[model samples]
Target: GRPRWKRHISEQLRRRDRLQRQAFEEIILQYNKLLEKSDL
Candidate 1:
């Protein structure tokens, strides 16, 4: 019945996933910007 502890651990895992997704998206955006510049 330690549901609170379960949620706490789950939240920590969720935070890691969130940061990974954020970093991946920013990298993709940066790559696209560089690609566009190279076309000139």
Candidate 2:
């Protein structure tokens, strides 16, 4: 019983997770920049 389908699904989930993480990092960077300007 080869679980080929499960392997494909797992890879897809991993790709989605990586993209979401990148987007979250960008948002945090933007927020920090805005906070710095407001402090001035």
Candidate 3:
């Protein structure tokens, strides 16, 4: 295939995407920890 502009191909876009994912995942991790503590 000769398609252009693959997802996360640019450095800036990759950095931004990584940052977004890290934040989202961190939030989820925090929520899970809170839920576990509440259940204990």
Maximum-TM-score candidate: 2
TM-scores, one per candidate: 0.45, 0.48, 0.45
lDDT of 2 by residue, 1-40 (tens): 6599999899989899898876698889999999999999
lDDT of 1 by residue, 1-40 (tens): 6699899999988898888876698889999999999997
Candidate 2: where are CA atoms >4 Å away?
26-40
Once fitted onto the true fold, the runs of candidate 3 whose alpha carbons sit more than 4 angstroms away are 1-16
Instruction: Report every candidate's CA lDDT.
Output: 0.89, 0.89, 0.79
By TM-score, highest first, what's the ranking?
2, 3, 1
Better of 1 and 2 by lDDT: 2
Instruction: Score candidate 2 by TM-score against the native.
Output: 0.48
> Model 1, residue 38: what's the lDDT?
100
Q: Any residue pairs clashing in model 2, and if so which?
A: none
Q: Which stretches of candidate 1 lie over 4 Å from their true place?
A: 1-20
Comparing 1 with 3 on TM-score, the higher-scoring candidate is 3
**Model 2 per-residue lDDT at 12:** 88
